[PDB]
Amino acid sequence: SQIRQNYSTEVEAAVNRLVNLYLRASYTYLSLGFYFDRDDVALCGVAHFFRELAEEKREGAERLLKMQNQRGGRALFQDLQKPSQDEWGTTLDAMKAAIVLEKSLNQALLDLHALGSAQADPHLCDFLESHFLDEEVKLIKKMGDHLTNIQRLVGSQAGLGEYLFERLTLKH
Amino acid sequence: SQIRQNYSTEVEAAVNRLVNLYLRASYTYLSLGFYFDRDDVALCGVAHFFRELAEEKREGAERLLKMQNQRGGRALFQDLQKPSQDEWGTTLDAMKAAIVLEKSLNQALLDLHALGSAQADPHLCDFLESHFLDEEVKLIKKMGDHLTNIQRLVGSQAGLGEYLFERLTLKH
Amino acid sequence: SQIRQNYSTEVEAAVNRLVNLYLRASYTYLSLGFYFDRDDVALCGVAHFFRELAEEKREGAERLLKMQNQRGGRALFQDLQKPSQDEWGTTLDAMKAAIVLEKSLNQALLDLHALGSAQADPHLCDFLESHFLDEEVKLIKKMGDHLTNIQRLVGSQAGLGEYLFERLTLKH
Amino acid sequence: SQIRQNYSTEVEAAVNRLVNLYLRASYTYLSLGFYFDRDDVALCGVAHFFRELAEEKREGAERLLKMQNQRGGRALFQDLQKPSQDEWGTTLDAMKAAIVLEKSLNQALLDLHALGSAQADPHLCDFLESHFLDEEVKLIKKMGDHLTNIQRLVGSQAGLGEYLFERLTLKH
Amino acid sequence: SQIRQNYSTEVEAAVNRLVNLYLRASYTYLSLGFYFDRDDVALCGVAHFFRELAEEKREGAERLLKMQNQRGGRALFQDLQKPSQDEWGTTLDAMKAAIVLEKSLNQALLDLHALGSAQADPHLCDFLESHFLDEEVKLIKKMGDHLTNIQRLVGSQAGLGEYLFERLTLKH
Ligand SMILES: [Pd+2]
Ligand SMILES: [Pd+2]
Ligand SMILES: [Pd+2]
Ligand SMILES: [Pd+2]
Ligand SMILES: [Pd+2]
Ligand SMILES: [Pd+2]
Ligand SMILES: [Pd+2]
Ligand SMILES: [Pd+2]
Ligand SMILES: [Pd+2]
Ligand SMILES: [Pd+2]
């Protein structure tokens, strides 16, 4: 290094883990994105929603890696586990799986902020705030909104509701 | 001629047949296009979808004919059989008939490419690639997507789903 | 006069009657237009569709009156009977009543053309062609298209279909 | 239907026949268009002249089909016979065959107008006037002009005249 | 090298030969181009037609050489034989010699594609397709068209036809 200052080995390690988490989340969204582009699923707006998220999670991993280098920490990459599912069911199933995924990332961010606080590392605490914490809260709110609307559309005709939600809410 | 080189009589004949196939497909789509413009059918977006395809298949026949002349082959036209139906039923029925039609054209293209390969005619093989093969794959994918969405909309209220699909997917 | 030439008293009288018919049709559409603007009916697109027709039928009467003066005939106005209904029921009911109304105007136009032919009055025959006959055919076709779509939307949930048709077909 | 008014079964049938005629004429011009693009014929302006006509005749069939639906008639398609020739000889031969073809279409239009008159169908009579009758007269006049100029160029050197006509009159 | 992969010595050698062929063809067209600029020949459009081809064949050799380096093959240049003639006779003679030349290049391209296929070298097969095969087919078609028109103009007055072709087809 030569630059490292007030940056604990504990935070460095947690940041590398959080990179793996974000990359895993990107991979999961990549899978979701292609599943909804299958000719037997064919929900364009849902596919684009998840493809967009795959890109956001990748960008989050890259921002963490840049920060790791800015602090004099060292990136360490691990094997990326495949997503939990090969097929993702309905839009409802997928949005449920998405909120749980996001909740898990948010909790990892909270655990890291807690560690930053315990380690008296305010640069970390700020970094997470501006790039990650508020973004997660806004995203989880949106998914909750979507889940509520998906659920109101289930009714007795599930196909009709799945079509209308994709057409009228997720418009490409 | 004076220009013909490496262009077998077998390929020349197959190209003339494929022209007839494409023209037949154009005629079929012309019929479909007008059927959905009937006052007792009246699905504007479906009519435009098939009218657009009638034009594409005609253009495909014309490109084959131009290629036939470029190679020194001779166009031979045959009687064009009328479409298989006078009335085409629902949007679902029509999209089903469309995919089968496209599959039959795609298989004719594949048979011709195979013949090109057996005849060692790379100009042919390339021509088909760029103008026909990838276009068919994209088109069949789209029709599969449409079929999936049509089918999800059938539910218990078929009229409602047929209206919504035309309004929200085929928007003119 | 001083200008009247080849213009029979029979045609002059029929033209005055046709003016009354067109004005009556305008009045009927005026009533329809306001009925769909009632707070307990409230179908904006349907209201605008009929208001637009009230204006078209008025313009048709004015064109006939201008022609009457161009030929040296004399406008004679009669009492305008009120519309056949005070309340018009559903969009379906109204579109049914509209097509019958239009059919009755079209038949009056046909009867007048027949009279023009019997009276050897080609200026009349042409006038009706360009301003009235083709317009009626296009309009009746459109109403037939609408009726078909309204009817497909009735299903088991009439309110839903009436709302969707107004929102998605009659968009203001 | 629900819209059909003053539209006889005789006219409906004649319109379907006239569609077949126009489509046949389009096919004939398509054949002519490609024949003049053969490397051993190679008269660019003549090819474009006939290709342009193939498109015009197709558009004429489509306008008739649209009108058939506007009146509440039902399109019925028949097998399209191949053109009368596989090879078309000289520009002269082709222009001679073109005028006869056009004369045959014009006579079909005249027969249909006569039927419209006998059936007291002024909408038909007008439709044919504006879209077909005057167009045929202008086109036949042009072909007559071309035939006269082709014939003056035959002389003792037929190749020279055929080249000059294509270069100087049919300029692409 | 360090980059060479799936690139046989047989293909490398054939590519070097094809470079020599293309350069020879450029030289031949250079000779043709200047012959038609002689004060006692003086056919401007014919000169420009061949000068343009000299440049195209040179560009083809350069594209092959670039590809040879892209694959890790090594350019080897050989003595360039002078053209088969010092004087080229009529436009007809020259266009005849041009088509034979082009046919010989096309056959070399076909032989190389065949070799690519036997050597399982798809990058080669594609390269030839896009840059060479379709270009040759279009060019040979054009020369066939020209030959047909030249021949129709010979008549009984060869000078007149040679002048008219240069003026009216090869316009600079
Ligand atoms: Pd999409
Ligand atoms: Pd999309
Ligand atoms: Pd439409
Ligand atoms: Pd439309
Ligand atoms: Pd309104
Ligand atoms: Pd409104
Ligand atoms: Pd051309
Ligand atoms: Pd041209
Ligand atoms: Pd020059
Ligand atoms: Pd010059």
Side-chain angles (χ1 to χ4, degrees), chain A residues 1-128 130-156 158-172, chain B residues 1-128 130-156 158-172, chain C residues 1-128 130-156 158-172, chain D residues 1-128 130-156 158-172, chain E residues 1-128 130-156 158-172:
Chain A
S1 194
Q2 102 219 115
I3 68 176
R4 186 179 193 141
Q5 184 168 210
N6 195 222
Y7 194 65
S8 65
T9 58
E10 289 87 0
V11 165
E12 181 184 15
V15 164
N16 283 149
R17 294 195 290 271
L18 191 64
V19 167
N20 192 85
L21 279 180
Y22 267 74
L23 261 7
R24 276 174 63 196
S26 182
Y27 205 17
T28 297
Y29 288 129
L30 179 73
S31 180
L32 278 156
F34 283 99
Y35 168 81
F36 286 96
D37 177 67
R38 287 176 39 168
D39 73 272
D40 63 347
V41 176
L43 288 168
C44 168
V46 185
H48 307 284
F49 178 77
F50 294 122
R51 293 290 297 289
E52 162 260 315
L53 289 171
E55 168 180 341
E56 293 188 12
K57 295 309 172 191
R58 175 190 51 90
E59 286 164 352
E62 293 166 354
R63 202 182 303 273
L64 292 161
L65 288 163
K66 181 189 186 169
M67 181 275 288
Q68 179 84 109
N69 276 346
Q70 292 175 320
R71 299 293 306 273
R74 291 295 175 249
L76 284 170
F77 294 99
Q78 299 297 349
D79 291 348
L80 282 197
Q81 65 192 89
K82 71 182 190 185
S84 68
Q85 298 173 227
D86 292 322
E87 289 169 309
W88 298 98
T90 63
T91 302
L92 218 207
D93 295 324
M95 197 68 65
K96 281 176 175 174
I99 301 185
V100 349
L101 181 48
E102 288 311 318
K103 284 167 175 243
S104 79
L105 290 182
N106 197 219
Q107 190 53 242
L109 293 172
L110 295 172
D111 299 344
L112 180 61
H113 193 284
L115 183 53
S117 191
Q119 290 287 344
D121 191 337
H123 180 271
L124 208 238
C125 122
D126 185 51
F127 167 86
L128 293 168
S130 49
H131 306 289
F132 294 83
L133 274 2
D134 185 43
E135 291 68 13
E136 279 308 306
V137 157
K138 287 171 67 170
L139 175 60
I140 296 171
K141 176 60 167 65
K142 185 171 275 335
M143 292 177 175
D145 294 351
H146 288 166
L147 231 26
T148 292
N149 281 104
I150 296 161
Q151 287 163 147
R152 68 163 46 94
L153 279 164
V154 172
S156 30
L160 170 66
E162 191 162 20
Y163 177 78
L164 281 171
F165 182 76
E166 178 271 336
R167 292 283 92 182
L168 270 12
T169 292
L170 305 177
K171 334 167 281 190
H172 223 254
Chain B
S1 194
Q2 102 219 115
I3 68 176
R4 186 179 193 141
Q5 184 168 210
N6 195 222
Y7 194 65
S8 65
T9 58
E10 289 87 0
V11 165
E12 181 184 15
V15 164
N16 283 149
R17 294 195 290 271
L18 191 64
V19 167
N20 192 85
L21 279 180
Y22 267 74
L23 261 7
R24 276 174 63 196
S26 182
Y27 205 17
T28 297
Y29 288 129
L30 179 73
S31 180
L32 278 156
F34 283 99
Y35 168 81
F36 286 96
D37 177 67
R38 287 176 39 168
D39 73 272
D40 63 347
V41 176
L43 288 168
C44 168
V46 185
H48 307 284
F49 178 77
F50 294 122
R51 293 290 297 289
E52 162 260 315
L53 289 171
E55 168 180 341
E56 293 188 12
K57 295 309 172 191
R58 175 190 51 90
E59 286 164 352
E62 293 166 354
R63 202 182 303 273
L64 292 161
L65 288 163
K66 181 189 186 169
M67 181 275 288
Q68 179 84 109
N69 276 346
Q70 292 175 320
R71 299 293 306 273
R74 291 295 175 249
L76 284 170
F77 294 99
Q78 299 297 349
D79 291 348
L80 282 197
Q81 65 192 89
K82 71 182 190 185
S84 68
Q85 298 173 227
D86 292 322
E87 289 169 309
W88 298 98
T90 63
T91 302
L92 218 207
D93 295 324
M95 197 68 65
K96 281 176 175 174
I99 301 185
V100 349
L101 181 48
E102 288 311 318
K103 284 167 175 243
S104 79
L105 290 182
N106 197 219
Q107 190 53 242
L109 293 172
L110 295 172
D111 299 344
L112 180 61
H113 193 284
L115 183 53
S117 191
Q119 290 287 344
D121 191 337
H123 180 271
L124 208 238
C125 122
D126 185 51
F127 167 86
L128 293 168
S130 49
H131 306 289
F132 294 83
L133 274 2
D134 185 43
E135 291 68 13
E136 279 308 306
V137 157
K138 287 171 67 170
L139 175 60
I140 296 171
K141 176 60 167 65
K142 185 171 275 335
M143 292 177 175
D145 294 351
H146 288 166
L147 231 26
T148 292
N149 281 104
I150 296 161
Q151 287 163 147
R152 68 163 46 94
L153 279 164
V154 172
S156 30
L160 170 66
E162 191 162 20
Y163 177 78
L164 281 171
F165 182 76
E166 178 271 336
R167 292 283 92 182
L168 270 12
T169 292
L170 305 177
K171 334 167 281 190
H172 223 254
Chain C
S1 194
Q2 102 219 115
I3 68 176
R4 186 179 193 141
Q5 184 168 210
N6 195 222
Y7 194 65
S8 65
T9 58
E10 289 87 0
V11 165
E12 181 184 15
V15 164
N16 283 149
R17 294 195 290 271
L18 191 64
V19 167
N20 192 85
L21 279 180
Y22 267 74
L23 261 7
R24 276 174 63 196
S26 182
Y27 205 17
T28 297
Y29 288 129
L30 179 73
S31 180
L32 278 156
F34 283 99
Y35 168 81
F36 286 96
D37 177 67
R38 287 176 39 168
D39 73 272
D40 63 347
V41 176
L43 288 168
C44 168
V46 185
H48 307 284
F49 178 77
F50 294 122
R51 293 290 297 289
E52 162 260 315
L53 289 171
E55 168 180 341
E56 293 188 12
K57 295 309 172 191
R58 175 190 51 90
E59 286 164 352
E62 293 166 354
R63 202 182 303 273
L64 292 161
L65 288 163
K66 181 189 186 169
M67 181 275 288
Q68 179 84 109
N69 276 346
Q70 292 175 320
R71 299 293 306 273
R74 291 295 175 249
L76 284 170
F77 294 99
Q78 299 297 349
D79 291 348
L80 282 197
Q81 65 192 89
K82 71 182 190 185
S84 68
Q85 298 173 227
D86 292 322
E87 289 169 309
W88 298 98
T90 63
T91 302
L92 218 207
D93 295 324
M95 197 68 65
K96 281 176 175 174
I99 301 185
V100 349
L101 181 48
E102 288 311 318
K103 284 167 175 243
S104 79
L105 290 182
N106 197 219
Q107 190 53 242
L109 293 172
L110 295 172
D111 299 344
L112 180 61
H113 193 284
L115 183 53
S117 191
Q119 290 287 344
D121 191 337
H123 180 271
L124 208 238
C125 122
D126 185 51
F127 167 86
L128 293 168
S130 49
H131 306 289
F132 294 83
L133 274 2
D134 185 43
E135 291 68 13
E136 279 308 306
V137 157
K138 287 171 67 170
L139 175 60
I140 296 171
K141 176 60 167 65
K142 185 171 275 335
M143 292 177 175
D145 294 351
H146 288 166
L147 231 26
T148 292
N149 281 104
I150 296 161
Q151 287 163 147
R152 68 163 46 94
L153 279 164
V154 172
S156 30
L160 170 66
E162 191 162 20
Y163 177 78
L164 281 171
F165 182 76
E166 178 271 336
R167 292 283 92 182
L168 270 12
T169 292
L170 305 177
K171 334 167 281 190
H172 223 254
Chain D
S1 194
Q2 102 219 115
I3 68 176
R4 186 179 193 141
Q5 184 168 210
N6 195 222
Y7 194 65
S8 65
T9 58
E10 289 87 0
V11 165
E12 181 184 15
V15 164
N16 283 149
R17 294 195 290 271
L18 191 64
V19 167
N20 192 85
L21 279 180
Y22 267 74
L23 261 7
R24 276 174 63 196
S26 182
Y27 205 17
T28 297
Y29 288 129
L30 179 73
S31 180
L32 278 156
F34 283 99
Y35 168 81
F36 286 96
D37 177 67
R38 287 176 39 168
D39 73 272
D40 63 347
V41 176
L43 288 168
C44 168
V46 185
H48 307 284
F49 178 77
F50 294 122
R51 293 290 297 289
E52 162 260 315
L53 289 171
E55 168 180 341
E56 293 188 12
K57 295 309 172 191
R58 175 190 51 90
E59 286 164 352
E62 293 166 354
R63 202 182 303 273
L64 292 161
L65 288 163
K66 181 189 186 169
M67 181 275 288
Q68 179 84 109
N69 276 346
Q70 292 175 320
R71 299 293 306 273
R74 291 295 175 249
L76 284 170
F77 294 99
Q78 299 297 349
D79 291 348
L80 282 197
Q81 65 192 89
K82 71 182 190 185
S84 68
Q85 298 173 227
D86 292 322
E87 289 169 309
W88 298 98
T90 63
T91 302
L92 218 207
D93 295 324
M95 197 68 65
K96 281 176 175 174
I99 301 185
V100 349
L101 181 48
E102 288 311 318
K103 284 167 175 243
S104 79
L105 290 182
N106 197 219
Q107 190 53 242
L109 293 172
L110 295 172
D111 299 344
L112 180 61
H113 193 284
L115 183 53
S117 191
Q119 290 287 344
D121 191 337
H123 180 271
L124 208 238
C125 122
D126 185 51
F127 167 86
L128 293 168
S130 49
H131 306 289
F132 294 83
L133 274 2
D134 185 43
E135 291 68 13
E136 279 308 306
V137 157
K138 287 171 67 170
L139 175 60
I140 296 171
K141 176 60 167 65
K142 185 171 275 335
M143 292 177 175
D145 294 351
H146 288 166
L147 231 26
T148 292
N149 281 104
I150 296 161
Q151 287 163 147
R152 68 163 46 94
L153 279 164
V154 172
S156 30
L160 170 66
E162 191 162 20
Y163 177 78
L164 281 171
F165 182 76
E166 178 271 336
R167 292 283 92 182
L168 270 12
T169 292
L170 305 177
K171 334 167 281 190
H172 223 254
Chain E
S1 194
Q2 102 219 115
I3 68 176
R4 186 179 193 141
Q5 184 168 210
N6 195 222
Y7 194 65
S8 65
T9 58
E10 289 87 0
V11 165
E12 181 184 15
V15 164
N16 283 149
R17 294 195 290 271
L18 191 64
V19 167
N20 192 85
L21 279 180
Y22 267 74
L23 261 7
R24 277 174 63 196
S26 182
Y27 205 17
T28 297
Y29 288 129
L30 179 73
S31 180
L32 278 156
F34 283 99
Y35 168 81
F36 286 96
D37 177 67
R38 287 176 39 168
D39 73 272
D40 63 347
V41 176
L43 288 168
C44 168
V46 185
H48 307 284
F49 178 77
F50 294 122
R51 293 290 297 289
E52 162 260 315
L53 289 171
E55 168 180 341
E56 293 188 12
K57 295 309 172 191
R58 175 190 51 90
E59 286 164 352
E62 293 166 354
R63 202 182 303 273
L64 292 161
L65 288 163
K66 181 189 186 169
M67 181 275 288
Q68 179 84 109
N69 276 346
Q70 292 175 320
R71 299 293 306 273
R74 291 295 175 249
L76 284 170
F77 294 99
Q78 299 297 349
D79 291 348
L80 282 197
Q81 65 192 89
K82 71 182 190 185
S84 68
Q85 298 173 227
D86 292 322
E87 289 169 309
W88 298 98
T90 63
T91 302
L92 218 207
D93 295 324
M95 197 68 65
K96 281 176 175 174
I99 301 185
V100 349
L101 181 48
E102 288 311 318
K103 284 167 175 243
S104 79
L105 290 182
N106 197 219
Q107 190 53 242
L109 293 172
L110 295 172
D111 299 344
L112 180 61
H113 193 284
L115 183 53
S117 191
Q119 290 287 344
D121 191 337
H123 180 271
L124 208 238
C125 122
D126 185 51
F127 167 86
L128 293 168
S130 49
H131 306 289
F132 294 83
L133 274 2
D134 185 43
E135 291 68 13
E136 279 308 306
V137 157
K138 287 171 67 170
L139 175 60
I140 296 171
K141 176 60 167 65
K142 185 171 275 335
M143 292 177 175
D145 294 351
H146 288 166
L147 231 26
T148 292
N149 281 104
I150 296 161
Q151 287 163 147
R152 68 163 46 94
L153 279 164
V154 172
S156 30
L160 170 66
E162 191 162 20
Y163 177 78
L164 281 171
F165 182 76
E166 178 271 336
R167 292 283 92 182
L168 270 12
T169 292
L170 305 177
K171 334 167 281 190
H172 223 254

